[PDB]
Design a protein around this ligand. Structure first.
Ligand SMILES: *CCC(=O)Nc1cc(-n2c(=O)ccc3cnc4ccc(-c5cn[nH]c5)cc4c32)ccc1C
Length: 307
């Protein structure tokens, strides 16, 4: 049948003795994530990594959901999307991921805005868009996109994460239709909210929202607003306000994402190019005051195999 190449993504399973969890960066009701060093058996190289230990799965269906989340995470191989290093099937499943010290992107902008250069913002937007498109190329829908779900290895480099929501697409199907689950409203495209329908075009809407957050240095969208309204207002046609920084050229794009009709909103591939175009000259596009002024362990990416 289809000529598509076999996907040889390899899922490594790890003994607990293989890694240790030094401190815990974050604790989640869904899961706990630990700062940890994973040392592969054999090679005396320590890879700093982050471990997520998820809550026990009460039901098999939950069990399946993890496997898929793992399945994709292992599968993806791009710079701006973080691959899953390995899994160990302990009673409480533990997922091993590359460790990004700076942490949540949303968190970073909030704490580094003053030092937060305009040029960086254009680049991140490029980087994020670059990642999502790859996801689009894989027929993968990232159900949840937010600043929160983007992690910074460094200010220079950022990659996507937190895919549990994300679902793969049957070739026949253009769109993926959800069943009721906890969802954060502000990011979701109306089509998703009203009809529990997701498509990459759905993702873009959220992606645009992420940019808004970047532009605003983490200001929370629809701040102080109930989830329920959100369906109503957009139907209303209200949209997130322009970033003070943004040139209409930029804020304009973000608006385009929020267009009610999915097809009308820009395809991701487009976004990378356009933003990249801005990136060559951020200064014209983004107006930031004082803009001009603005040991024994090997990292995994270095770790990754070379011909
Ligand atoms: C915006 C909310 C957020 O970022 N939470 C969060 C941050 C985490 N975190 C951190 O707080 C400090 C350092 C740090 C370094 N590397 C990572 C790597 C991966 C994650 C992560 C979180 N969720 N999925 C992956 C976090 C990291 C760091 C850690 C967890 C959370 C939830």
């Amino acid at each position: 049948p289809s000529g598509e190449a076999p996907n040889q993504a390899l899922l490594r399973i790890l003994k607990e003795t293989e890694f240790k969890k030094i401190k815990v960066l974050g604790s989640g009701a869904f899961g706990t994530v630990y700062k940890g060093l994973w040392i592969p058996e054999g090679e005396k190289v320590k890879i700093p990594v982050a471990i997520k230990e998820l809550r026990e799965a009460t039901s098999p269906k939950a069990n399946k959901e993890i496997l898929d989340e793992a399945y994709v995470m292992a599968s993806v191989d791009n710079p701006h999307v973080c691959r899953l290093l390995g899994i160990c099937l302990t009673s409480t499943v533990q997922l091993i991921m590359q460790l990004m010290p700076f942490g949540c992107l949303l968190d970073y902008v909030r704490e580094h805005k003053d030092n937060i250069g305009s040029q960086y913002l254009l680049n991140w937007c490029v980087q994020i868009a670059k990642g999502m498109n790859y996801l689009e190329d894989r027929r993968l829908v990232h159900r949840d996109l937010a600043a929160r779900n983007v992690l910074v290895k460094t200010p220079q480099h950022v990659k996507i994460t937190d895919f549990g929501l994300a679902k793969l697409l049957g070739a026949e199907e253009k769109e993926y239709h959800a069943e009721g689950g906890k969802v954060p409203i502000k990011w979701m495209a109306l089509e998703s909210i009203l009809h529990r329908i997701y498509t990459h075009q759905s993702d873009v809407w959220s992606y645009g929202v992420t940019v808004w957050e970047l532009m605003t240095f983490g200001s929370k969208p629809y701040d102080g607003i109930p989830a329920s309204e959100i369906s109503s207002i957009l139907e209303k046609g209200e949209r997130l306000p322009q970033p003070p920084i943004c040139t209409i050229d930029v804020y304009m794009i973000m608006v385009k994402c929020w267009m009610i009709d999915a097809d009308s909103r820009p395809k991701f591939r487009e976004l990378i190019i356009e933003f990249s175009k801005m990136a060559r000259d951020p200064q014209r596009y983004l107006v930031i005051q004082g803009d001009e002024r603005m040991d024994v362990v090997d990292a995994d990416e270095y770790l990754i195999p070379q011909q």
